[PDB]
Design a binder for this molecule. Sequence first.
Ligand code: FMN
Ligand code: FMN
Ligand code: FOT
Ligand code: FOT
Lengths: 313, 313
Amino acid sequence: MCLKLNLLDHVFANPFMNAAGVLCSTEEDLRCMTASSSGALVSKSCTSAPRDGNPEPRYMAFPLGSINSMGLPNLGFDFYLKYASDLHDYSKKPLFLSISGLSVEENVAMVRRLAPVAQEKGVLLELNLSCPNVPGKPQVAYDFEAMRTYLQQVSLAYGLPFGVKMPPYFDIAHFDTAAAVLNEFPLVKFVTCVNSVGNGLVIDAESESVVIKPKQGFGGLGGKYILPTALANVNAFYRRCPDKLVFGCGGVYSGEDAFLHILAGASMVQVGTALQEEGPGIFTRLEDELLEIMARKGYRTLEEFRGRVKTIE
Amino acid sequence: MCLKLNLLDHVFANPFMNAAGVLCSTEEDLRCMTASSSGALVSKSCTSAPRDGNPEPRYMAFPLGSINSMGLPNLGFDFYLKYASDLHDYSKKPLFLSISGLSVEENVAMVRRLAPVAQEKGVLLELNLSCPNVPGKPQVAYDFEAMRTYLQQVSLAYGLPFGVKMPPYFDIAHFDTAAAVLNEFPLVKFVTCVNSVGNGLVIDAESESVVIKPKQGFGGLGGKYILPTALANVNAFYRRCPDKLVFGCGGVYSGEDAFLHILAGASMVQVGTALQEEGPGIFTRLEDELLEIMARKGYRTLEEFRGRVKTIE
Ligand SMILES: Cc1cc2nc3c(=O)[nH]c(=O)nc-3n(C[C@H](O)[C@H](O)[C@H](O)COP(=O)(O)O)c2cc1C
Ligand SMILES: Cc1cc2nc3c(=O)[nH]c(=O)nc-3n(C[C@H](O)[C@H](O)[C@H](O)COP(=O)(O)O)c2cc1C
Ligand SMILES: O=C(O)c1[nH]c(=O)[nH]c(=O)c1F
Ligand SMILES: O=C(O)c1[nH]c(=O)[nH]c(=O)c1F
């Protein structure tokens, strides 16, 4: 069996890709993600100018997942745009470029320059409205008026299809309001659920200390901690945005976890923590494992089960 | 070495208690919690009238924690008020009564009647502003104006010290606004962080189905999934409400987990999912394991290390 999508006017070998931020900051990283067996890749969220990010240590991993307060360390938008315009081999797989300006004006400045390169090369924008780790800059999509202003200004400056990286929500009223805001914007063609679960705190019992330096230890959680939260958000936006695509991210370590994301409604499945820990070999194991679960169940296509999670009664 | 605490004008043999909702709905449950080695107990959140709750199955547990959408099944306020007034043995340990009216008016009606029993017997109110499982009733403490109204009306009607069971937050701005609202109310003497992490979705891969029946499978998460979220909220409100107590709840399975809660600022430590799974024998184990950690570190009392989590740099 082989794993075939035609999403967003592109073709993908399989639904897997890295999650933004993981294995995608430098040219070396992007060449490594391009050489891997993933179906696509996305760049590190960038800002207009290069950033060194927050002080180290700023990432730690544990058996149940990871915590991070990277603080958008990146080579600057000029680098990621050059990689998309001049360096990426689009014959290998599609590229998404993630942007995370610290203001609506900074996002609008980057998308105005991205648009010609999207027209010429077909790079796909993922607009990050959910960074939880820049001091004093709360997650934009937890302020629904700020979210609306960002999506209005980016849709008018960019003028092309794009997607949005969403924070997790935990309240049904918030799922209803956030999806209604998204559905105001016909240029939003995909919704990535979820970014890290913000502002958790890991403490080491032996040393009686937090494990990361920024923000007194507070950072975003990924990995096994967050799978049922990620699944809920994937499904909630798949139910409420029937004319958009949902990309799943959060807690994928196995082909079975990917199967659950796709059953909840995911079109692509992004891999963060587990890719950071295992490296890019993970993508051959996740495709093998997903194909094996499909064969055991008699599924021949992703479409046969995407979004077909069953409810009781 | 000593687990004793003296707070809120009561003495507690040790910091452990059930989390509201677990092993506390019937008279039998409350007698069992009283017979256990816990330092205190809290009753199931109640409403004015008895409720049957949401349809079954409505709780499921797994190796990394639990999901529930119980729907406030309870024997009604009259029952829990009579247990507090006539049945509980206060010589064995202190009792908290949790109330979760579905409107401000319902809460006010109950606290008007509780006040004379609190004055006479010393039962302590825990006001639940965070139930994530009654369809159409979003968590009250995710609407800061609703939270201030409830606290104003309950403070005026009740007139006595009480505490609040808070939802988890994921955003530094929310920690700052929530604690500022609580700090407007001098009768709020303790803050219990956290209730379940709302509206997660567990899916069984084999059956391709959600595992609980209410709300299309969406329910609150407890257990191993939520410990770093619980520790962040305990510490965030510990640091922001220096004139109140913080009670920790979320992810406690071991004495080490309780140690981390207490390092983060917890006074009492409540146990939900792991007490639902293990039963009330867990309190002797958590006590032994916390005293073992204290012995190895040279700590003789809880106040030698409560709130003393170290940050880097
Ligand atoms: C080291 C690290 C850096 C990340 N940087 C970004 C980022 O630049 N942009 C972004 O949208 N999400 C970023 N995230 C969040 C991930 O894309 C993903 O949403 C989150 O880690 C959850 O997926 P997981 O459970 O597979 O880790 C980052 C996560 C990690 C661990
Ligand atoms: C079956 C069940 C019933 C619960 N009922 C209540 C409740 O009545 N009131 C409440 O404040 N929290 C309720 N909770 C939340 C728990 O008190 C606790 O905040 C949550 O389970 C996190 O703690 P844990 O990680 O130890 O499970 C309930 C949780 C469970 C699992
Ligand atoms: O750079 C980071 O800190 C980072 N980490 C995350 O978990 N999400 C982001 O959106 C992000 F930009
Ligand atoms: O009864 C419930 O569903 C319930 N479950 C919870 O996890 N928290 C509550 O506050 C609650 F009332």
